[PDB]
Design a protein around this ligand. Sequence first.
Ligand SMILES: C[C@H](CCC(=O)O)[C@H]1CC[C@H]2[C@@H]3CC[C@@H]4C[C@H](O)CC[C@]4(C)[C@H]3C[C@H](O)[C@]12C
Ligand SMILES: C[C@H](CCC(=O)O)[C@H]1CC[C@H]2[C@@H]3CC[C@@H]4C[C@H](O)CC[C@]4(C)[C@H]3C[C@H](O)[C@]12C
Ligand SMILES: C[C@H](CCC(=O)O)[C@H]1CC[C@H]2[C@@H]3CC[C@@H]4C[C@H](O)CC[C@]4(C)[C@H]3C[C@H](O)[C@]12C
Ligand SMILES: C[C@H](CCC(=O)O)[C@H]1CC[C@H]2[C@@H]3CC[C@@H]4C[C@H](O)CC[C@]4(C)[C@H]3C[C@H](O)[C@]12C
Ligand SMILES: C[C@H](CCC(=O)O)[C@H]1CC[C@H]2[C@@H]3CC[C@@H]4C[C@H](O)CC[C@]4(C)[C@H]3C[C@H](O)[C@]12C
Ligand SMILES: C[C@H](CCC(=O)O)[C@H]1CC[C@H]2[C@@H]3CC[C@@H]4C[C@H](O)CC[C@]4(C)[C@H]3C[C@H](O)[C@]12C
Ligand SMILES: C[C@H](CCC(=O)O)[C@H]1CC[C@H]2[C@@H]3CC[C@@H]4C[C@H](O)CC[C@]4(C)[C@H]3C[C@H](O)[C@]12C
Ligand SMILES: C[C@H](CCC(=O)O)[C@H]1CC[C@H]2[C@@H]3CC[C@@H]4C[C@H](O)CC[C@]4(C)[C@H]3C[C@H](O)[C@]12C
Ligand SMILES: C[C@H](CCC(=O)O)[C@H]1CC[C@H]2[C@@H]3CC[C@@H]4C[C@H](O)CC[C@]4(C)[C@H]3C[C@H](O)[C@]12C
Ligand SMILES: C[C@H](CCC(=O)O)[C@H]1CC[C@H]2[C@@H]3CC[C@@H]4C[C@H](O)CC[C@]4(C)[C@H]3C[C@H](O)[C@]12C
Ligand SMILES: C[C@H](CCC(=O)O)[C@H]1CC[C@H]2[C@@H]3CC[C@@H]4C[C@H](O)CC[C@]4(C)[C@H]3C[C@H](O)[C@]12C
Ligand SMILES: [Zn+2]
Ligand SMILES: [Zn+2]
Ligand SMILES: [Zn+2]
Ligand SMILES: [Zn+2]
Lengths: 321, 322
Amino acid sequence: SKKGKDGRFVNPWPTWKNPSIPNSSVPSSKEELDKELPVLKPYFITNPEEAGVREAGLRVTWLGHATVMVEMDELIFLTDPIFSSRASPSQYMGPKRFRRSPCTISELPPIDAVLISHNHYDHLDYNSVIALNERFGNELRWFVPLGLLDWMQKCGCENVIELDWWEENCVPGHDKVTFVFTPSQHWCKRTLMDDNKVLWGSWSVLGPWNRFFFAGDTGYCPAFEEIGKRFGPFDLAAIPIGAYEPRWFMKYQHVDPEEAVRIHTDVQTKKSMAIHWGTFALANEHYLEPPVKLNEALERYGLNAEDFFVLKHGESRYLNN
Amino acid sequence: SKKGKDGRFVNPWPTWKNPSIPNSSVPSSKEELDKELPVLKPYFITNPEEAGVREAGLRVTWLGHATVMVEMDELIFLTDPIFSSRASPSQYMGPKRFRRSPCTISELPPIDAVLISHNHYDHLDYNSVIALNERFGNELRWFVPLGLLDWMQKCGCENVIELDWWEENCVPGHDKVTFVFTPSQHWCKRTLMDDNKVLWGSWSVLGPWNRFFFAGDTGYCPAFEEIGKRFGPFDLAAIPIGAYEPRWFMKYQHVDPEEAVRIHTDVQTKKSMAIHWGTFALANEHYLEPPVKLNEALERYGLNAEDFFVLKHGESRYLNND
Ligand SMILES: C[C@H](CCC(=O)O)[C@H]1CC[C@H]2[C@@H]3CC[C@@H]4C[C@H](O)CC[C@]4(C)[C@H]3C[C@H](O)[C@]12C
Ligand SMILES: C[C@H](CCC(=O)O)[C@H]1CC[C@H]2[C@@H]3CC[C@@H]4C[C@H](O)CC[C@]4(C)[C@H]3C[C@H](O)[C@]12C
Ligand SMILES: C[C@H](CCC(=O)O)[C@H]1CC[C@H]2[C@@H]3CC[C@@H]4C[C@H](O)CC[C@]4(C)[C@H]3C[C@H](O)[C@]12C
Ligand SMILES: C[C@H](CCC(=O)O)[C@H]1CC[C@H]2[C@@H]3CC[C@@H]4C[C@H](O)CC[C@]4(C)[C@H]3C[C@H](O)[C@]12C
Ligand SMILES: C[C@H](CCC(=O)O)[C@H]1CC[C@H]2[C@@H]3CC[C@@H]4C[C@H](O)CC[C@]4(C)[C@H]3C[C@H](O)[C@]12C
Ligand SMILES: C[C@H](CCC(=O)O)[C@H]1CC[C@H]2[C@@H]3CC[C@@H]4C[C@H](O)CC[C@]4(C)[C@H]3C[C@H](O)[C@]12C
Ligand SMILES: C[C@H](CCC(=O)O)[C@H]1CC[C@H]2[C@@H]3CC[C@@H]4C[C@H](O)CC[C@]4(C)[C@H]3C[C@H](O)[C@]12C
Ligand SMILES: C[C@H](CCC(=O)O)[C@H]1CC[C@H]2[C@@H]3CC[C@@H]4C[C@H](O)CC[C@]4(C)[C@H]3C[C@H](O)[C@]12C
Ligand SMILES: C[C@H](CCC(=O)O)[C@H]1CC[C@H]2[C@@H]3CC[C@@H]4C[C@H](O)CC[C@]4(C)[C@H]3C[C@H](O)[C@]12C
Ligand SMILES: C[C@H](CCC(=O)O)[C@H]1CC[C@H]2[C@@H]3CC[C@@H]4C[C@H](O)CC[C@]4(C)[C@H]3C[C@H](O)[C@]12C
Ligand SMILES: C[C@H](CCC(=O)O)[C@H]1CC[C@H]2[C@@H]3CC[C@@H]4C[C@H](O)CC[C@]4(C)[C@H]3C[C@H](O)[C@]12C
Ligand SMILES: [Zn+2]
Ligand SMILES: [Zn+2]
Ligand SMILES: [Zn+2]
Ligand SMILES: [Zn+2]
């Protein structure tokens, strides 16, 4: 069976799945925030000694927003890493995170990979890229959507692979682990009139012992079912649950928690972790709403927190095979 | 006796003292940096319970670069606070600090004041201003040079006083403590063609039990002798010791350690603390050189580390009165 294999107008990419048409969060007080969204020191600060591996995956650490660190099958990789305060081309305006990054880039050791779902300042953060590339160099491989190679090259990144969807590659030392850029329903833009000059997508990571899915930003299309059927079952999937209100505007580009759980099903993962949410105010929902709505969905679909969990900032979770 | 009381061309301010004419730092490796310039958690993180006061001053915490937290005579105040990574109007270019700020703005409680010496991205940091103002509001009074009021107002700061030199004011609750804007030899610029639209200076803080001096960025002029004589003796002075090489270009605007110790003498402080240095690479000296040269100066002038000390990032020091 074939898949959404996309896809251009004569210039930019469009989504092509037909669920696409081209059509009050309120935090404050340092005490309440710490109460509701505490920031934990990741394990690797006081126990830098080992992780990943061991021997059959799989460990994840939520570093906020859509940044997760994943340890499996002898690799540690990083998704959409944003360690800066502001997701913006400007110092002066644009969204400031209200929970600090749980660690600095000087802690970590990504061997040998990062995964970028789309450009977009809250996923592709120049200062984070620079810092990562200053620290590791060649020794870090960047997997990015078709059309971003150049941008990364100009940041000084030399070990970069650019992918159309359903295209696949690995990290040179570790050929047993396939990285596949898979579809998603979203968009790209960093400047004026660059709309969708670069692809957006999800990542399916296929190792000998484990399989991990990273949704990126989306919502809700076939494709998740295509992915679920082509790869899958997956062991863990990271799926956004924030930035969804108001529905009439956001639904084409952002799942709500209900739709998040439909992706969880469609993709055939044993478990999922909530990302996006709780970090930047990018839409109108009360900053604590997404986890509440997640649980309402789970209850409705006959599932459980065990199946689709939300971490604290900086928390880790081990998933035994 | 009178003082350099300055001073304009017909537009911008100029220095007017005649020591003014209008004419390789190499860090790296996380391990070495932590070895040479460790970053300490300030006391107020695990012991937020009391400071300052007690009862007769004075406590200081070095937060990096020219940002110092000072506790005396029932106030806590903050100088040139920069808690961001990059001193720049851009995200994309401009100097990145190589030692992280030792704390976030969410730790602290400045009652009720910040002191700005000059505009200039490594001393006036927008994101730090916004964050401070978001946290405290009206409760925090900002003392700034003549010409900066509006800029601050547009940041949303509502409790702001602007001062020419030798002008004085206090924090409303605490009238026993006088803040005086005093001269310095430096310059101002944030954009194109705004050179010296806003004054630059130092701050003399006069309390019932203590007196503190903050040099700002400068190099070496009379004025420090004017300040030493008008106010003074001082209990503590914070004085820059980095950003001085190459001398032929920088000496009109930045003291070297040697000149730092001349300021220490001129200003008649019992003690001084090194600031500027060790945080951003703003000039050409080896990042560790300033402290070495400071000690060579101290030795030459018959003084001691006890007289003019350097802190680690985030370290505090208490100075008991007498
Ligand atoms: C240069 C000043 C800052 C001066 C200061 O800090 O005192 C800043 C403040 C606001 C900044 C502008 C914000 C809007 C635009 C943002 C774009 O992404 C780049 C160009 C513009 C036009 C920016 C140009 C420049 O970055 C400005 C004008
Ligand atoms: C920073 C200068 C003005 C500085 C001055 O008055 O000297 C002003 C003048 C024009 C200003 C822009 C006008 C259009 C926009 C209006 C928005 O509400 C905020 C962002 C923008 C992009 C503004 C950003 C910034 O506030 C600018 C660039
Ligand atoms: C301007 C500096 C170079 C400064 C120097 O020469 O020292 C360079 C170095 C890296 C450059 C960026 C690389 C990533 C991007 C490449 C894009 O096609 C244009 C925008 C960006 C964001 C570039 C903007 C700018 O051109 C930067 C920041
Ligand atoms: C105005 C210069 C002309 C180049 C030059 O001066 O040599 C052009 C060249 C490329 C243009 C910038 C590069 C980044 C973006 C390219 C976008 O597609 C339009 C917005 C931006 C931010 C552009 C704004 C500006 O118009 C630039 C800088
Ligand atoms: C908007 C892109 C960033 C695009 C990206 O991050 O991918 C950035 C990259 C370099 C940026 C330019 C750097 C030089 C200038 C800095 C000034 O202080 C404000 C205007 C200029 C002209 C900036 C405009 C804008 O801020 C640019 C063009
Ligand atoms: C970011 C655009 C180009 C993006 C593109 O080609 O599409 C480029 C085009 C012109 C570039 C500027 C040219 C003059 C400067 C050259 C310096 O060595 C780095 C800073 C400046 C200020 C550059 C900053 C930035 O690198 C710009 C604005
Ligand atoms: C200031 C930082 C680095 C300072 C540091 O981290 O130590 C660097 C990064 C990019 C550099 C700027 C790029 C644009 C300009 C390049 C020209 O040749 C003249 C110097 C300028 C104005 C540079 C000023 C300074 O050399 C910058 C801003
Ligand atoms: C552009 C935003 C407003 C955004 C909004 O309307 O939400 C405003 C809010 C505060 C503004 C800044 C206040 C300090 C400065 C005032 C100067 O005279 C022009 C440059 C600065 C740096 C301003 C640039 C810009 O005009 C800002 C950043
Ligand atoms: C003179 C002002 C800045 C004065 C300041 O605020 O420091 C600067 C700002 C931008 C500078 C221009 C950049 C574009 C041109 C580049 C050429 O290589 C020299 C001539 C030009 C026309 C430059 C002339 C002069 O060097 C300018 C206009
Ligand atoms: C080009 C606009 C015109 C205002 C408008 O468009 O509404 C003007 C208004 C004020 C100007 C900016 C405000 C901040 C700075 C003012 C400086 O003296 C020159 C450089 C800057 C960064 C200016 C660049 C730019 O040229 C601006 C934004
Ligand atoms: C280096 C390019 C010129 C490239 C060219 O001529 O084609 C020019 C264009 C704009 C120039 C900058 C204008 C703003 C600053 C003004 C200062 O008074 C000198 C340092 C800076 C940062 C200038 C240094 C540098 O010379 C720039 C970036
Ligand atoms: Zn996003
Ligand atoms: Zn997005
Ligand atoms: Zn300075
Ligand atoms: Zn300065």
